[PDB]
């Protein structure tokens, strides 16, 4: 891309444990929303970021146009960097600190 | 029952690079939730990984207990795993890559 890159917060880390990785998820978006114009992600590259991101979480053994269906009832505002960590906050009810008696 | 300490997934390296990010911040629930039975928060365990683990992300100088009055406004459910993740919604509209358009 270009004929330029950045290096300010590029790499992310005189920050804490979680500080730090927090930034990591909010990057993922950043380095995929190229075609969403980096104001938004648009579905056929929500699509190419989940096969290569999530193998333990979601697979290319089912469609992946369910996520899409999901996050596409934006017709205004469309998938802004929200729209990504609102499937962050659905992979955090299938992984989290695996605990003896998980839950309740 | 029991003081007992032990995991799974506690070195992470199979994973994608933000597939072991998710885990990585979310340990810091179960890990701070001492009070909170592992599976809620309280007040102190609050203000105390604010401080600590967010240093860059809410400074003393704003006061710490402006991350507890946004989870103040909920008590009949109690605290839950689901009311910490709700504040790290509010660290991403403080924190995202340091590019042009970061949103509007």
Redesign the interface.
């Known amino acids: 891309m270009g004929q330029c890159r ?1 290096a ?3 790499d992310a880390q ?6 730090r ?8 978006f ?1 380095q995929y929303s190229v075609e969403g ?3 938004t992600l648009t579905p056929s590259e929500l699509r190419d970021l989940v096969t ?6 979601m697979p290319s053994n089912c469609g992946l146009e369910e996520k899409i269906a999901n996050l596409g009832s934006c017709n205004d505002s469309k998938l ?3 729209s990504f ?1 609102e499937l ?2 659905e ?2 009810k299938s ?6 008696v998980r ?2």
């Open positions: 950045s300010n917060a590029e005189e920050f804490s444990d979680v500080e990785a927090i930034e990591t998820l909010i990057k993922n950043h114009g980096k104001e290569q991101q999530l193998p333990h979480l802004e960097f929200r960590w962050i906050g992979a955090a992984v989290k600190l695996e605990r003896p839950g309740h």
